[PDB]
């Protein structure tokens, strides 16, 4: 069958923000017909390129009833746990992902680069071994989303 859900756009809200602020995404999509089963959205923070074990599922949203037509919703998730981020990966560029599954199958993955940078010159010039997350600013590169679609069984 044809893809029954088509994501139209994601707006990154509160985009330059302190590291400890929650993520906020305003997501619009279309359903070509009433879906009987649930859509599950997730936000996944890539703690390190070292390994997927440093991935953090920040939150999941499950919608039981699906109606046909255009949709908008706002997806908010708490910031990642800095205790689980390797020291060498915290300051710099990482990735945050938005995924959606239907009947348990991921059909779309929207990835953004995330640039975490210090706000004080002293910290930028002499970064501590353990990063000071209270002084880190998160900038999501909202203009350059990377979209991957997956074929799933929509019936």
Numbering used by the authors: 2 to 156
What is written in the article reporting this PDB entry?
By binding histone H3–H4 dimers, the histone chaperone ASF1 facilitates nucleosome assembly and turnover and modulates histone post-translational modifications. Specifically, phosphorylation of the C-terminal tail of histone-free ASF1 by tousled-like kinases (TLKs) increases its association with the H3–H4 dimer and downstream chaperones, which has been suggested to promote the provision of histones for chromatin assembly.
Apo-ASF1a-NT crystallized in space group C2 with seven molecules in the asymmetric unit, while the complex with the TLK2 peptide crystalized in the P21 space group with eight complexes in the asymmetric unit. The ASF1a structure exhibited little variation between the chains in each structure, with an average root mean square deviation (RMSD) of 0.65 Å between 153–155 residues for the seven chains in the apo-ASF1a structure and RMSD of 0.39 Å over 151–154 residues among the eight ASF1a chains in the ASF1a·TLK2 peptide complex structure. Notably, aside from re-orientation of side chains interacting with the TLK2 peptide, the ASF1a Ig-like domain did not display any significant structural changes between the apo and complex form, with an average RMSD of 0.59 Å over 151–154 residues between chain A of apo-ASF1a structure and the eight ASF1a chains of the ASF1a·TLK2 structure.
